[PDB]
Amino acid sequence: ASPISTIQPKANFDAQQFAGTWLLVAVGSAGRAEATTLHVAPQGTAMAVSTFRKLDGICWQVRQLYGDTGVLGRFLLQARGARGAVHVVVAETDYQSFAVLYLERAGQLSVKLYARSLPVSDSVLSGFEQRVQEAHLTEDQIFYFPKYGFCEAADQFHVLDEV
Incomplete structure (x- = not known):
């Protein structure tokens, strides 16, 4: 049914090794x-996931909880009440340099590096691009974030605490 259910999560996903700081590189999505x-x-x-974004020189923080959905590597961002539930899967990662996550909101799949x-x-980067293509998204639907x-x-x- 759900597009994300077809994506295989990281084998034996280990939250302990995935802990720490991650920088968002790019996002493949159809949705500054x-x-x-x-x-x-x-x-x-x-x-527990906190996301920090710099908006017009001011740093914002959003606290969220990626709930465990039973399958290792698959999580759930609580249907905030106002806006649907977001399913998340950590597909591929070496824990030490990169991570490819897939997100699903209202049946729509997105991929983040x-x-x-x-x-x-x-x-x-090429691998990520290869995965975006396979997810039926185009090169033009890939948005690179600031470095x-x-x-x-x-x-x-x-x-903003959403927990």
């Missing part, structure tokens, strides 16, 4: 990109 950083922390079998640091190896202007901390007036 800000420098985005992810801070991941295991929480039981789920993962994350890196531990820049630059991303040519091999991984500068990242932020990883916000003050109390710019924190």
